[PDB]
């Protein structure tokens, strides 16, 4: 007897309690990557007729990478919260299991569910857990992972270019990625997540500080000029522990006298380069 398709890896996403409720206004001043991710998955999943009538072969899959904590997860959170069609995700390590050959089932059933369900979007992260460079086909432990790579790479190609399934790829270290995995036909679009420096820095400041007190005079543009390449994630940490400092002194409004010691608490990278060498 034949059966309707089924996957257990990522059931679906019940989506009523699974929405991350992250707004596009929540992410701070990253108009660029939001623009080409709307161009990448949002518009083609709906206006597929436009892409066929212009004939610019819309991308099967787009990979995102970069330094850690540049917002690579919250972009996925926001597009999953704001999508109209179906979406699915799985942590990118569950394709290894206790027994033999479960992983090929774990990828084939989720691809089959993506095909069956809707014009959906599948999210895969940490490809370095599943995509390495070399292999030792004598451990047995490795044999499963070049296998599961084998099957994912094959079941990429089982699309008719008409199904509106979009895969979004996340990783931290792009060095381990095999070039044929990013070969055109599989991942024809790649985007890096650069560390914001000045243009976005006051923007992410403003977005994270819109929910704070900042009573009358707490300056921010004196902090945007400070060098040494502050990342994106740690601004959240700065505001968070500044609030911790404010609540330790039993004060319900954060003052400007908190932020300088708050800033010197976190970064702490002093010089690491002797000045005569400069």
């Amino acid at each position: 007897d034949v059966l309707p398709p089924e996957a257990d890896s990522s059931i679906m996403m019940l989506t009523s309690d699974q929405k991350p409720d992250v707004m596009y206004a929540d992410i701070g001043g990253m108009d660029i990557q939001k623009q080409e991710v709307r161009e990448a998955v949002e518009l083609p999943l709906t206006h597929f007729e436009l892409y066929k009538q212009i004939g610019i072969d819309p991308p099967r899959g787009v990979l995102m990478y970069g330094p850690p904590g540049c917002g690579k997860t919250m972009l996925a959170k926001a597009v999953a919260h704001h999508t109209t069609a179906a979406f699915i995700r799985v942590v990118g390590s569950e394709f290894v299991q206790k027994y033999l050959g479960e992983g090929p089932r774990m990828v084939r059933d989720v691809f089959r569910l993506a095909k069956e369900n809707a014009p959906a979007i599948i999210f895969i992260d940490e490809i370095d857990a599943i995509a390495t460079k070399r292999f030792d086909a004598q451990t047995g432990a490795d044999r499963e992972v070049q296998r599961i790579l084998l099957e994912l790479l094959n079941q990429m190609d089982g699309f008719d270019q008409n199904v509106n399934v979009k895969v979004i790829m996340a990783t931290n270290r792009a060095d381990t990625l095999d070039p044929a995995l990013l070969r055109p036909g599989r991942l024809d679009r790649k985007i890096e997540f650069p560390l914001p420096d000045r243009r976005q820095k006051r923007l992410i400041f403003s977005t994270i500080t819109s929910k704070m007190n900042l009573s009358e005079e707490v300056d921010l543009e004196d902090y945007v000029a400070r060098p040494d390449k502050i990342s994106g994630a740690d601004i959240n940490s700065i505001c968070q522990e500044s609030g911790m400092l404010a609540v330790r002194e039993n004060r319900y409004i954060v003052l400007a006298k908190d932020f300088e010691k708050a800033y010197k608490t976190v970064i702490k990278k002093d010089e690491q380069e002797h000045e005569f060498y400069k």
Partner: protein
Amino acid sequence: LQSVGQIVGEVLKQLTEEKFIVKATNGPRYVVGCRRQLDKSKLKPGTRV
């Protein structure tokens, strides 16, 4: 003599109220039904049996 009912699995999806799909903790999945007093609505996808 009748406490041999020993093997443990996990349910996958509801086919009908009497047709179910389960996965053994050893290997292959299976098609399995239930007795008529097990609260078949309570057997959500995601529980051990």
